[PDB]
Amino acid sequence: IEYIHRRLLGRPTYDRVENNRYFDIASKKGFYGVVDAMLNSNEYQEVFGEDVLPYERYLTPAGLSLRKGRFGSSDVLTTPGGITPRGDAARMMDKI
């Protein structure tokens, strides 16, 4: 159910309520009950309409750290008002 949700709608599940609504349909109608219930949601019509193909909309941070994240973060956390000597040597070298 969780994998089919990502394929049919561009996001993983949000809530235990959202998971249970499809679970209690899968226990009564099976695979066709789950897929039909997913494709007949108000969210599908609101987002994808009737001409647009479904597309990936949201990512979990675990997945987002897989696509990016290799070689880490090069930005260095900057923080406001901190005391930092970074760049002073380069500025002095340019002034010289």
């Binding site: 941070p61 675990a62 987002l64 750290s65 994240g69 973060s73 930005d75 260095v76 956390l77 900057t78 923080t79 406001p80 008002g81 901190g82 930092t84």
Partner: protein, 161 residues
């Protein structure tokens, strides 16, 4: 999510008891402070944007955050950061109205730490912004709801840090 009244009802139902004197006193304890909470919530809703503006001015902008190399650099990241500030303010208002940080635990802090670590957001800077918003809100609301407002901002800050 759960509030004072629903919390009392649930913590009596799971033990299968009826509403006794202790739960009754708890519920009138919530009821007596109803007007102060709603007045503070109305004030916060009316002054939402000004609070975020002043908190950002005091804690975030005019620093290395908004310069290149800072996380708050670029219009996209600036808009996202002020959106996050609005998130924290609105959920603090909901928690103050309901008299319970359960909404903060369920819908704010769950996985927020790992999400911020994945995105590279400065958590210390976020906590500083939350405290600036708390100071401004305590200024606006007054002593009547200043403490009740401050406890949920402090809960958010302690959860994040």
């Amino acid at each position: 999510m759960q509030d004072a009244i629903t919390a009392v009802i649930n913590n009596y139902d799971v033990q299968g008891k009826y509403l006794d004197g202790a739960a009754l006193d708890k519920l009138k304890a919530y009821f007596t402070t109803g007007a102060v909470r709603v007045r503070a919530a109305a004030v916060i809703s009316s002054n939402a944007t000004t609070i975020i503006k002043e908190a950002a001015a005091k804690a975030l902008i005019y620093s290395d955050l908004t310069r290149p190399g800072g996380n708050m650099y670029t219009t996209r990241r600036y808009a996202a950061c002020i959106r996050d500030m609005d998130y924290f303010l609105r959920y603090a208002t909901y928690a103050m109205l309901a008299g319970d940080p359960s909404i903060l635990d369920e819908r704010v802090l769950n996985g927020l730490k790992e999400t911020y670590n994945s995105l590279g957001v400065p958590i210390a800077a976020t906590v500083g912004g939350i405290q600036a918003m708390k100071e401004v809100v305590g200024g606006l609301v007054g002593p009547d709801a200043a403490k009740e407002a401050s406890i949920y901002f402090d809960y958010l800050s302690s959860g994040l840090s």
